[PDB]
């Protein structure tokens, strides 16, 4: 690598995120569907084949953005919310806070502020706060997994669970264990690069989430 190229790639990620935020802000106004469920979060959400794995009878709208962290979501929360009859918001975020060494208390405070902001504007809407998903710690996946570890992820998940217990409208959704193998790693078949999910991974995640859609 090359530090000039480092900056410009960081710049590439920022401009892609800004482009997607702009896209969502305009769709929020002109969309022809009413979201029953909004899926909000990071790359795992953006790339989730929601239609093809959950079907179309329940309208689930994607408001995920690659590389997102809790602070970015809080700052731009308006891009991720619309509709007159939102039953539930599914929130999957934090793996990138871990990958950037964001203090857990800062991430939590960010999540708490998101919950409170949603309560004001969407008072009858439930939030399903997903466990951060496991990673695969095999050497071959070190490039995507980076400083994430399943011990850190499990510690954050304990904190998310405690945060959920403080709000009647928030339910913690334990999906971590559904995606692990017997060594407590994200299953090889469920991953492309140790962090992101394969289609088998998304299928397994969807099976674990289905009941929470109702």
């Amino acid at each position: 690598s090359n530090a000039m190229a480092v900056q410009l790639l960081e710049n590439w990620l920022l401009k892609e995120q800004e482009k997607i935020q702009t896209k969502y802000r305009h769709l929020n106004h002109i969309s022809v569907v009413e979201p029953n469920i909004l899926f909000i979060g990071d790359s795992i959400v953006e790339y989730y084949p929601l239609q093809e794995l959950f079907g179309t009878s329940k309208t689930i709208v994607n408001r995920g953005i690659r590389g997102y962290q809790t602070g970015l979501l809080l700052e731009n929360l308006d891009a991720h919310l619309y509709g007159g009859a939102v039953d539930k918001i599914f929130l999957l975020i934090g793996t990138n806070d871990i990958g950037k060494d964001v203090p857990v208390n800062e991430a939590l405070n960010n999540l708490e502020a998101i919950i409170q902001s949603v309560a004001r504007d969407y008072p009858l809407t439930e939030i399903k706060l997903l466990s951060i998903l496991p990673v695969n710690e095999r050497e071959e996946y070190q490039q995507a997994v980076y400083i994430r570890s399943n011990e850190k992820i499990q510690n954050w998940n304990q904190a998310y669970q405690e945060l959920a217990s403080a709000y009647m409208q928030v339910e913690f959704v334990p999906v971590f264990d559904c995606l692990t193998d017997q060594a407590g790693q994200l299953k090889k078949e469920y991953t492309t690069d140790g962090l992101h999910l394969s289609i088998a991974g998304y299928q397994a995640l969807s099976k674990s989430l289905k009941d929470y859609l109702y």
Copy 2:
């Protein structure tokens, strides 16, 4: 006796026609019901779109004159959709009006609940309290043998049934609709039994939070 029997025949014919309509519509409908409203004439004549709006797709499967037995026997006509979040059920005032024994009506309702629990396992049933009537003499032609004392007793039984089933929530709306004398408000009714638009506005306001 003879003309009254022919009127009962009329009603049955109309109900059968509506059941056919519904079976056919369920098959080719261009919408996915988020919520199904099922019940008797108070449901059939409910102006759902104009009082709740269309953010949620709320589909009407009500039938005038319906009773719990008729609904059970024809339950297939009243259910469709791939992701029904909620079924709102308002029925029983015609069971009372026809002197159907409460235990029969409650067994019919339990069977409905168990059927939906099996076939629509993640769907919630919102079991409404039967609505109050107005017992004043001027409304006797519609109200007939119904009384608010009977209705409240049946509502207690509905509440108890709902308590036995995870997917069922009893929705107490009776009290929203009464005047200080415990009668369906005169302004809320057309004939002492059916609702005026003001009655439907009051009912809608009471149901709004149960939609989520």
Copy 3:
């Protein structure tokens, strides 16, 4: 004669009740109609939501047994909204059924069109052809004195009236509902006059280019 008068009285009472319902709903509806459907029982009973969907807000202002004169007299009950794009009007089969003189019905329709042109100047009116009936003897109870010959003559008059008014388009749907004998298809009808769900599917398909 006593009972025939009572049946007339029954219908009159129900129509008045629906007019009151609509006047009240017009006042407090939570939706802005993009399209109003106005007319007789074929409109009242039209499953608009489940056949057209809800991408546009389509509001039902039909009344069973309606005739052009009753609609004109009560036109206020059928119209509301701050930006109505289209009004679909299906009416006249009960004028024919009651032997209303054609010139009277056409004068009534012209008055309705002129009223809407004044009060809803940016709204398009879609004036549907009266639908065919089935003339087979099994359907004589509903069909009565209606005939496809009379209906087609009235439709020619409707087309002429529409041609005179800028914001009125005649919508020829009659031929979309007939079999090879020129009758309303048996599968399209419940009683020879009213539509089955298949008949409403065919009518909805033929209206789609005028709606969207």
Copy 4:
């Protein structure tokens, strides 16, 4: 060479999407009524939020795609037992890479023939390639594409469509141009890709072909 490795980036991202689609084709829980196939403009198209879900429309677009890549990997883009229509938007990257028009048309003809045998009751809607905006400010995305080229390719697409009863040419180019014949500024992000206003205008133009 950084450009060699950017070419390599794109190829690897395309292969990853092909893998994803091939697996989805097997385990999808929906029966697509309409498949949208093509390049970046398709991948990034907000189909659900702009067309709604009265019909099940499935996205099988891939960024940077060209007619040859599509033909070689056509299996990744097709599935379902009841597909009413396929919408195909592709060619702007063939123009951008200076692929001979004859080569691109033979690839498209090969694609149409393959779909014909496997999906005989399915209509193919072959879209006109969309206009670009030729202003200098957009040159990083637009590159060697010109509206003159695009219109010439669209004439050829129209002729190819005329040779198959199952294929209808869908002329949307003119719906997206300004008075100078450029892609309208408010319809574009970078002179080539569409803004949401652009996708809404495209959707409005396509509605009569979808429903």
